[PDB]
Amino acid sequence: CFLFICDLIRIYHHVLKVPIHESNMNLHVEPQIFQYELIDYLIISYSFDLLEGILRVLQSHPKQTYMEFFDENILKSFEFVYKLALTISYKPMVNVIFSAVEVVNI
Amino acid sequence: LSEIAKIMCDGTSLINQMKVNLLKKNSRQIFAVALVKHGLFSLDILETLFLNRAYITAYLPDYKTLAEITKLYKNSSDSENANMILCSLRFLITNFEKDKRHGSKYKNINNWTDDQEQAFQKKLQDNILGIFQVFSSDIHDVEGRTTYYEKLRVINGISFLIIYAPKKSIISALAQISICLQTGLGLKEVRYEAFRCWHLLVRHLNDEELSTVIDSLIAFILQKWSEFNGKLRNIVYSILDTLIKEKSDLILKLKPYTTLALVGKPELGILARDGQFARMVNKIRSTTDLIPIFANNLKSSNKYVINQNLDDIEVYLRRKQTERSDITLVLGALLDTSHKFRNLDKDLCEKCAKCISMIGVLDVTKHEFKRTTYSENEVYDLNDSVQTIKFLIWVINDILVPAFWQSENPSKQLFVALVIQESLKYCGLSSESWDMNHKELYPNEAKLWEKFNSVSKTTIYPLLSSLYLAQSWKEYVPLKYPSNNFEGYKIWVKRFTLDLLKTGTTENHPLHVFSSLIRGSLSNFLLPYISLDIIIKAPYADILNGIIIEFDSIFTCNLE
């Protein structure tokens, strides 16, 4: 599930790295839908929220079943998402900010 | 004197080379100027300093360019001593005179030299150019030394220049120093005494002036009113008072629009302070179709001025319509506003759209003043030498003027001065248009060259540097191929360098080519006027050089 959703996220990696600010040309004239925004927002969030929940079920599993899951794939995939998330050159996004950093906490 | 040695050593083994380099810097750096202001003006003592740690050749040679502004940058009641010291340093610019007894005599008592009362005039009007170049380099460059300390000091010095400058050197780059101080005031901290300086200007300039700089200030103030404290408002009030009193016809008759806007902004107490002022303002206003006035104000580009225009136009239209009641040009003005905005600042574009909402489609039968064409007119550049004169004046007046005025480009004004004076050798004697019966009768006064008429009639300083561009002439494949490949800006540059290739006759074309030689759309505009000589000739080398591109670009590698 986990990898499937991280790379789901990289299928929606087109979110958490939206620019640092609305440029003079970039408009906010809009179809004004909160629909697909909330859509992908729920998506991204809920997904990171997966990351959260299943990873914490990992942490709450018996200590025996631990290293069998941890490979450098976790580092690389979560590295993709973290870089996507806690931007230093885009808009940060408090929820994903949350999620990502607690994964660090994980 | 060993302090400089320690500083260089920290800079060690080649500390002698460091001393050589530092002395080279001090040639035009502030070392000579500040020593002049601190100790004395003796060029012999200057040689003594040149022997402090060594390194004297540049003394006679490097006496003019940068040390002038270096000294100027300290103009800051007891300091009248420093004022006279500085004024004496200004007196002594001539390196030969420094070598002469003038070297130790130009720092004399208040009653200094009196042939200087015109020779010194000439001196200052000369390198007013250089010192402006210095300050614009200090302002509009990157200035990794951001350090608005320099900005403050330069403002102090230029203010003292208003304290002491003839009309001629004033107008030498009045508009330039205007833009310099203007962007200063735009910067946050400067305003506190940028407005002080503005008032200093106000107290004594002119009547023909006090137009081309004031509206910028007016827009600024009647726009940013929110972020003005008490004493800012106080100095503002003083400024208003000066506006009212010392130059009233300007606010009332020569730029009344400011009055319209400020009165329509009723948190200022214009009638409260002066009810008589209010009367005149309102009268002239209700009297002459303000639409063309807002049209002229929209012809000031920038941004603050444009926004003020939009808002005031909206208000006027609203009240007039609520009543019951030329009309057209505001529409196209807004058109351009948005069109330039079409890539920059959506808020400005929305303001233009709000004004268009108030207006709208209206009637098409109502004649639309959209033009037919423009002036690509010619005037025998070969024969009818009088028409050649027409040709040159047409070139300079058409677009070279506002570029020479509105551009924010330090060095380009250098070419401006140089080649425009080179064109002004047709009216080289200042008295031709100045005091005389002389029938110079210069056309194309344009109220800007008219504003510049004296400041350029005989203020010529040659400034004619250009070299080493012939062989690489991108022409014939080196041009058609480069343009078909990419880039296009440099393609235009290279093509227009067809003059550097095989044109540039010393009569007109040399100066004309060297004009844009500093080197960006102007390229395209100047381009149409080259190959006529050769196609007359009846040469073939440059003919092919041009024709190769001018016909290969017909379909040069489409669908790249």
UniProtKB/Swiss-Prot annotation, chain A:
Forms a complex with MEC1. The gene is LCD1. Signal peptide: none annotated. Forms a complex with the serine/threonine kinase MEC1 which activates checkpoint signaling upon genotoxic stresses. The MEC1-LCD1 complex is recruited by the single-strand-binding protein complex RPA to DNA lesions in order to initiate the DNA repair by homologous recombination, after the MRX-complex and TEL1 are displaced. Required for the recruitment of MEC1 to DNA lesions, the activation of CHK1 and RAD53 kinases and phosphorylation of RAD9 in response to DNA damage. Required for cell growth and meiotic recombination. This is DNA damage checkpoint protein LCD1. Present with 606 molecules/cell in log phase SD medium. It is found in: Cytoplasm; Nucleus. Phosphorylated by MEC1 in a cell cycle dependent manner and in response to DNA damage. The chain holds residues 322 to 427 of 747 of the full protein.
Curated annotation (Swiss-Prot), chain B:
It is found in: Nucleus. Disulfide bonds: none annotated. Belongs to the PI3/PI4-kinase family. ATM subfamily. Serine/threonine protein kinase which activates checkpoint signaling upon genotoxic stresses such as ionizing radiation (IR), ultraviolet light (UV), or DNA replication stalling, thereby acting as a DNA damage sensor. Recognizes the substrate consensus sequence [ST]-Q. Recruited in complex with protein LCD1 by the single-strand-binding protein complex RPA to DNA lesions in order to initiate the DNA repair by homologous recombination, after the MRX-complex and TEL1 are displaced. Phosphorylates LCD1 and RPA2, a subunit of RPA, involved in DNA replication, repair and recombination. Interacts with LCD1, which is required for localization MEC1 to the RPA complex. Interacts directly with the RPA subunits RFA1 and RFA2. This is Serine/threonine-protein kinase MEC1. It comes from Saccharomyces cerevisiae (strain ATCC 204508 / S288c) (Baker's yeast). The gene is MEC1.
